[PDB]
Amino acid sequence: NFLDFEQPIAELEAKIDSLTAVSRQDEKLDINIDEEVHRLREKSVELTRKIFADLGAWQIAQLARHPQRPYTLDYVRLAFDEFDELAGDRAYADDKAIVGGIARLDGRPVMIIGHQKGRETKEKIRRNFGMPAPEGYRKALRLMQMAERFKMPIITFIDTPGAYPGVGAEERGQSEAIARNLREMSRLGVPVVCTVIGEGGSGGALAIGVGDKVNMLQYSTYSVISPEGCASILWKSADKAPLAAEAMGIIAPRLKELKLIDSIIPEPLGGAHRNPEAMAASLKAQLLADLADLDVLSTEDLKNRRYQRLMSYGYA
Amino acid sequence: NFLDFEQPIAELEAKIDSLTAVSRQDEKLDINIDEEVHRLREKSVELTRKIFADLGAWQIAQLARHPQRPYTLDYVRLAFDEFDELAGDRAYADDKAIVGGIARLDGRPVMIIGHQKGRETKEKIRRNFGMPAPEGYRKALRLMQMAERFKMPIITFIDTPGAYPGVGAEERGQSEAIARNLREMSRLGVPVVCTVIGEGGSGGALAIGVGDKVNMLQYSTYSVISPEGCASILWKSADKAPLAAEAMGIIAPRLKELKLIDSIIPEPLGGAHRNPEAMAASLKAQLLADLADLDVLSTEDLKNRRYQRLMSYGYA
Amino acid sequence: NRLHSLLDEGSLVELGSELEPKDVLKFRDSKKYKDRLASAQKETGEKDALVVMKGTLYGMPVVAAAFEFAFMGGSMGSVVGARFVRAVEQALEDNCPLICFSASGGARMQEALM
Amino acid sequence: PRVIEQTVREKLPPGFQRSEFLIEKGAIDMIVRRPEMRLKLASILAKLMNLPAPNP
Ligand SMILES: CC(=O)SCCNC(=O)CCNC(=O)[C@H](O)C(C)(C)COP(=O)(O)OP(=O)(O)OC[C@H]1O[C@@H](n2cnc3c(N)ncnc32)[C@H](O)[C@@H]1OP(=O)(O)O
């Protein structure tokens, strides 16, 4: 289930995990497990450090879509508490690709909206691999309005390959729903903080991502179009996707230096999948620090500051 | 195409219409058409007066659903001008059972929303016999909001057998859509006047009928449930529907004396189908008179008066 | 041409005409983005896709705008949004409806997230 | 439409994403031809702004 370039680490982990079982496997073997496990872990850590010292925009994309990575549910469980899931768009259905709800954080209730992908293949099929139908965006609009009503802070997550290009999505006003979202979210009276956990972008994800603060993970990409699509359009070939990724600058440092985000959230060594708990701790600390200073502003001044930052968009 | 009890009038009209053609039919016949036509018209008028002197709640229902009667489009054409039809619910479809749009009346633009049934069988099938799907109600909500925005008066019509009890209607939040309509329409800042042209009721029609004024035609019924349904439920038999209609009081005088409406709009003798133009003139005069006095009120005082009239509902 | 067709003659007033493509990303496609920028600019004779002209309609003042599709699929640049905001500001300070006619193949990729 | 074709790997509905179709699916208000467009826009703006209608 690992990527192409993760073979030196992969081989050694097929031997470290067994040693715990070998402690009482059979034949009365209780070998000197401790020292061998520690040595193998040292070797694996050194190999991982050497491998991930060299990083590439394609490697960045692969880690952003590694098929083992904390989704919105994982970050909610491992960084928030008392999460009550609210569903329903009031209109047609409750699309699984967006998960929203209300939770408490350090005694302060918050509204959490973000996409969810799924670990197993069945869950990935059920959640449409994180591609939101328009009714999901309407649900997000409703939740944001509800949070606006009861003076509630809003913190949202952005982990989605792209807005679903399906027959039903186009039949049901995809562009209309996204525009309606993008209009109201510029009138909210509460702070909006967003994170780019996993892989997010494609413009459609911006319907829950126009706020006072924007943050990105170390191994996350946020592009207007998918690198494969960009290659197949501009380079007239799909296999030149790594070249398109290098040219675009979808990697975290490129999008940070372009003054489009606030800060890059560091990951545990080995990426987020190796130690999701440390990643959750870092994300919790970052979001708490970001929410701390923002709450000082009053609603009118907050909206005015957001509007001025809205004008700050673009080079011209 | 006439009802059961309209046989004396029906026979004579099969001879009056021919005399115009007989004026140059064949064989050089140009008989003394004028006097015979006038005598036959006198006889037909006297028979119609005698027949409609005796009226019954069932007869009231039959005239309310006579398969020849001015619908919303007819009243718009023959009483309003410069009608621009706006369609689309922005969500799923544009259900034909509700026709809405914006038109000018005596130099003042108005918003016209009302159900439409159809004359031919094909049109009746296409319009679902005036049964609105929930998306139509969402469209009506959108149009009412638009009229509220640009300080525009709203005048609506109610001619529908009942909210559509279909699979799709229930699948798509029928009750939710009607409730959403009924909540917003109590917050509009502009007067709302409604008419009960044709046959309307069943509760669902009230989603466009909660306003400062309510008016009814002389041969129209406005009931909570359909008389046939009321019979089949309470009397355990469908054929006792006329008895249920008599007991309920769906006829215009009963609903007028119950202080639920403002005034009964008279019809041309012979009902509305005999002279739809005179009916349109009466309806235009009534709506103009009703709109005249209401426009004096300011928006805040108008909403307060509507709320007080909202409290005035019910016996307790 | 669309603006001329809609707006009355003798009232065309272009707004925000000083803005021009000022590329800052230096994109490296199969062709350099400057190549396509210059080609479109010299072909269409216009600075960007959006064209703004405050006019008057039947005695009623009105603002108008339109997208030139030939400008690399009429993509929305920073100049496009800034000119739209300028038209909105003119409408707010001088009360009049705003009209925009949409024609775009999508967002300008070579300007990325901007 | 090519992206949707590669996504659903099937056939688009007839008249896909046409103004006639998209007004059926409620996302489109009205279909107006260009020769009528000037008068229609003037009338609609005059009504919405509550201004007197243009003289034609
Ligand atoms: C993700 C985004 O927002 S941009 C993604 C691209 N756009 C889309 O996916 C939506 C529609 N996709 C399309 O391909 C078209 O817009 C369609 C379907 C309307 C087809 O219209 P067409 O007649 O094929 O126009 P076409 O795509 O050729 O546009 C003309 C030119 O504009 C260019 N163009 C159009 N949109 C863009 C864009 N967003 N960025 C850069 N160039 C663009 C094309 O490259 C083309 O250039 P070329 O003729 O010199 O090669």
From Swiss-Prot, chains A, B:
Q: Which InterPro entries match?
A: Acetyl_CoA_COase_a_su (IPR001095), ClpP/crotonase-like_dom_sf (IPR029045), COA_CT_C (IPR011763)
Q: Which residues form a coiled coil?
A: none
Transmembrane feature ranges: none
Instruction: Choose any GO biological process term that the UniProt entry carries and state it.
Output: long-chain fatty acid biosynthetic process
Named from the GO MF annotations, one term is: identical protein binding
Q: Which Gene3D superfamilies match?
A: 2-enoyl-CoA Hydratase, Chain A, domain 1 (3.90.226.10)
Q: Cite the entry's keywords alphabetically.
A: ATP-binding, Cytoplasm, Fatty acid biosynthesis, Fatty acid metabolism, Lipid biosynthesis, Lipid metabolism, Nucleotide-binding, Transferase
- Pathway(s) where this gene product acts: Lipid metabolism; malonyl-CoA biosynthesis; malonyl-CoA from acetyl-CoA: step 1/1
Q: Which GO terms describe its cellular component?
A: acetate CoA-transferase complex; acetyl-CoA carboxylase complex; cytoplasm; cytosol
Give the disulfide map. Answer: none
UniProt subcellular location = Cytoplasm
Tell whether ATP-binding is among the UniProt keywords.
Answer: yes
Which residues does the UniProt record annotate as the domain CoA carboxyltransferase C-terminal? Answer: 32-293
Report the catalytic activity. Answer: N(6)-carboxybiotinyl-L-lysyl-[protein] + acetyl-CoA = N(6)-biotinyl-L-lysyl-[protein] + malonyl-CoA
Q: Tell me, in a sentence or two, what this protein's role is.
A: Component of the acetyl coenzyme A carboxylase (ACC) complex. First, biotin carboxylase catalyzes the carboxylation of biotin on its carrier protein (BCCP) and then the CO(2) group is transferred by the carboxyltransferase to acetyl-CoA to form malonyl-CoA.
Member of which family? Belongs to the AccA family.
On assembly, the entry states: Acetyl-CoA carboxylase is a heterohexamer composed of biotin carboxyl carrier protein (AccB), biotin carboxylase (AccC) and two subunits each of ACCase subunit alpha (AccA) and ACCase subunit beta (AccD).
| Name of the protein | Acetyl-coenzyme A carboxylase carboxyl transferase subunit alpha
Curated annotation (Swiss-Prot), chain C:
Domain of life, source organism: Bacteria
Where does it live in the cell? Cytoplasm
Q: What does this protein do?
A: Component of the acetyl coenzyme A carboxylase (ACC) complex. Biotin carboxylase (BC) catalyzes the carboxylation of biotin on its carrier protein (BCCP) and then the CO(2) group is transferred by the transcarboxylase to acetyl-CoA to form malonyl-CoA. Controls translation of mRNA for both itself and the alpha-subunit (accA) by binding to a probable hairpin in the 5' of the mRNA. Binding to mRNA inhibits translation; this is partially relieved by acetyl-CoA. Increasing amounts of mRNA also inhibit enzyme activity.
- Quaternary structure note: Acetyl-CoA carboxylase is a heterohexamer composed of biotin carboxyl carrier protein (AccB), biotin carboxylase (AccC) and two subunits each of ACCase subunit alpha (AccA) and ACCase subunit beta (AccD).
- Which family is it part of? Belongs to the AccD/PCCB family.
Q: What is this protein called?
A: Acetyl-coenzyme A carboxylase carboxyl transferase subunit beta
Upper lineage is: Bacteria, Pseudomonadati, Pseudomonadota, Gammaproteobacteria, Enterobacterales
Q: Which gene encodes it?
A: accD
